[PDB]
Structure 1
């Protein structure tokens, strides 16, 4: 229905606003674009599904996310990729792991404060009907 298409349009407006707020935070600059395969040639042998905040906005605009749950699976993949590629005790690995955990915790905290639980349940019920 047109009312269901209006629901998904509101979901996209909300996800673009959350993603912009993460992308301007100086702590998260390393997660704003794909890892450059020229600069890091073993990256795509270790990490089988690369993800970053520029790819996330592209996916919102392609109508890939029909729930906040499917959006958070990609925020979780940005964080888990950083923990798996950079697992060592040295300061550069520890700094990126700390930033990755802060990106995930910031996204979940914005959604807990600003997403209505009945708006998410409506999106999940339209998705399950398709």
Structure 2
């Protein structure tokens, strides 16, 4: 219905705003673009499901997220990919992991403070009906 389309549009607007706040945070610059395969050529073969904030924005616009839970699964994937690609004790890896965890924690904290659970529940119940 019209009212359901309005609901998903509000969800997209909400998710774009949250993603934008993540993307302008200097800590998260490394997660704003997909990995360049001329800098780490083996990235695309190790990491089977690359995810980054540019891709998340593209998926919002393609109406791929019908719930906040769907969105957070991709934020979680940005984080978990980073933990797996950079597992070592050296400072470069530890810095990336810390930023990845912070990205994840920041998204969840924004959602906890700013998302009405009844709005999420509505999105879920529409998504289950289609």
TM-score by length of 2: 0.99
Deviation at 1:38, TM superposition (A): 1.1
Runs of 4+ in 1 over 3 A off after TM superposition: none
Deviation at 1:46, TM superposition (A): 1.1
**Cα deviations by residue, 1:18-58 (Å, 9 ceiling, x for unpaired):** 00000000000000000001110111121100000011011
Alpha-carbon distance in 2 for matches of 1:4, 1:122: 9
Structure 1 unaligned blocks of 5 or more: none
Number of positions where the alignment pairs a residue of Structure 1 with one of Structure 2: 130
- Please name the residue that 2:118 is paired with: 118
Deviation at 1:129, TM superposition (A): 0.3
Alpha-carbon distance in 2 for matches of 1:105, 1:63: 24
TM-score by length of 1: 0.99
Please give the secondary structure, in 2, of the residue aligned with 1:97.
helix
User: Which aligned pairs between 1:44-123 and structure 2 lie closer than 5 A?
Assistant: 44-123=44-123
Alpha-carbon distance in 2 for matches of 1:45, 1:126: 36
Question: CA RMSD of the aligned region, Å?
Answer: 0.4
Structure 2 unaligned blocks of 5 or more: none
